[PDB]
Amino acid sequence: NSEEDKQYLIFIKVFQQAMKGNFAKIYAKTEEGKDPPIKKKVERLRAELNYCYDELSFKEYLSDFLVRGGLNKYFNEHQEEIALLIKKSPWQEIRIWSLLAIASYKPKD
Amino acid sequence: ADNLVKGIHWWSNFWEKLVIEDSKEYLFNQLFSNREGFIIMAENSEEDKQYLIFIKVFQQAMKGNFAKIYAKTEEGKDPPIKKKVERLRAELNYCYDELSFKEYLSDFLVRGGLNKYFNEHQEEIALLIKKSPWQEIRIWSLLAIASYKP
């Protein structure tokens, strides 16, 4: 319930879809008998998330991550809501939401 | 005896009648003399064994907290149990509402180190701490201090 909670939940879904896309890209990148990453890529994503300062850097990185995720239906249905949510809101809160999405993305894969 | 006559818990008004209305630890000192009676009353309680489990958890936490400083302090510099227990009682008395008391109790439990009793009764003790009124938890912490065996 509540509009803010619904927007937050479906933004979590958006971020989880983006991480699925990025992890699939990493899977396609690696070849041969080398083990593709599962967990240390999540650690890399965490390190890149905490490497953030000011509003500009984090929003740039988040937008780049979302685009690199590729196709995503949750952002498809909700353009205005997530565009406003990302453009507005403190960047630290959005980082908290992104980390919460990271910690609960894995049931998909 | 008054609590038994009134039909309520035997620990119903222990805090405000034993700590608040104590002048120079006159009433507080009698708790350690009545420790055996406290242990007997807790063991033969007609119900509510979950709060006895909480007593065990709090006693383990108190053991850890006291042992930390007692290892920090060498022989001769080691203070008796009286000063540490008085400081603990004062800190418990500081708490004024549910949030502050539960925060202090949780921090005390964590500072107590590994707690086997809490681990064996995670869900029960967690629900008990979350749900029970903070005044009752404070009273039971007081009488767990009273029945603490060094």
Partner: protein, 289 residues
């Protein structure tokens, strides 16, 4: 007639530790308790404000029975028999001689309620420690402070005064309150009013007690409560008997449809001195001073 001066006065925002109670071990606990909607607020006792008013009367040069020695920190009575006809403090605050011709007690014209913090107490504490590496049992300590505004409610039975002219010094003292008992060395909290809601009426009923509210639970906003505004709108409170002064005047004037509201025709003054002067003129006319 029987005239009463009811009033709710709001203090300025600042850090306050004026209401310590029985300390628990090391830390000094300030008096607190439950209030609006179940949160804990810090209370400043009304006896503190009464003592401040007594000290104001003494310092201004008025004849006061109980003289307070600043250098000795003791209280001395000029006359062992209380005489409300001659002494301002006995006339205003009353007395009660309880020991084994003149009356032994008086009800007192001034009736005051406890001062309540506008904002709920968060739990802020401040550590104090004596300088020096030579440390003993009294080296370090904790003192609780509260960053809020205090509001309190008072009522004066003007006809109950032995001398009717003594109400004016009480108003002056309320607007020029000396230090209200607290920790002035480290938490200097001025208790002078910055927002007033007074009522000078011959009816005994008052609907202005604790009429101030907060916009945010942790903020220095101090808006007028909706219940008080509604009671002004419905006509329960006569606007001609309402006296509003202080910083709340700006917020009232920025309200929508203020010019059409019955609150407009109340005595509203941004300057508290002008409001006090007008109210004192009305009081002097009504009491025939």
């Amino acid at each position: 007639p029987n005239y009463y001066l009811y009033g709710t006065v709001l203090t300025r925002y600042g850090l306050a530790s004026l209401n310590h109670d029985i300390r628990r071990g090391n830390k000094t606990i300030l008096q607190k308790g439950y209030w609006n909607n179940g949160k804990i607020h810090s209370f400043v006792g009304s006896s503190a404000i009464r003592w401040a008013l007594r000290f104001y009367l003494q310092k201004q040069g008025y004849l006061v029975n109980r003289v307070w020695d600043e250098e000795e920190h003791i209280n001395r009575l000029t006359s062992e028999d209380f005489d409300p006809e001659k002494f301002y403090d006995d006339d205003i605050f009353g007395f009660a001689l309880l020991e084994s011709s003149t009356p032994n007690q008086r009800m007192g014209a001034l009736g005051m309620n406890m001062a309540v913090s506008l904002t709920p107490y968060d739990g802020a504490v401040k550590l104090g420690a004596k300088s020096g590496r030579e440390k003993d049992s009294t080296s370090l300590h904790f003192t609780e402070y509260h960053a809020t505004r205090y509001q309190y409610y008072f009522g004066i039975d003007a006809t109950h005064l032995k001398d009717f002219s003594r109400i004016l010094p009480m108003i002056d003292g309320i607007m020029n309150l000396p230090k209200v008992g607290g920790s002035s060395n480290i938490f200097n909290y001025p208790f002078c009013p910055d927002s007033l809601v007074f009522q000078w009426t011959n009816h005994f009923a008052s609907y202005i007690s604790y009429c101030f509210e907060y916009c945010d639970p942790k903020s220095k906003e101090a808006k007028l409560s909706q219940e008080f505004i509604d009671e002004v709108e419905c006509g329960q409170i006569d606007p001609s008997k309402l006296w509003i002064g202080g910083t709340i005047v700006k917020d009232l004037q920025q309200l929508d449809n203020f010019e059409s509201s019955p609150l407009n025709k109340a005595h509203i003054y941004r300057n508290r001195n002008e409001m006090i002067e007008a109210l004192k003129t009305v009081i002097k006319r009504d009491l025939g001073l």
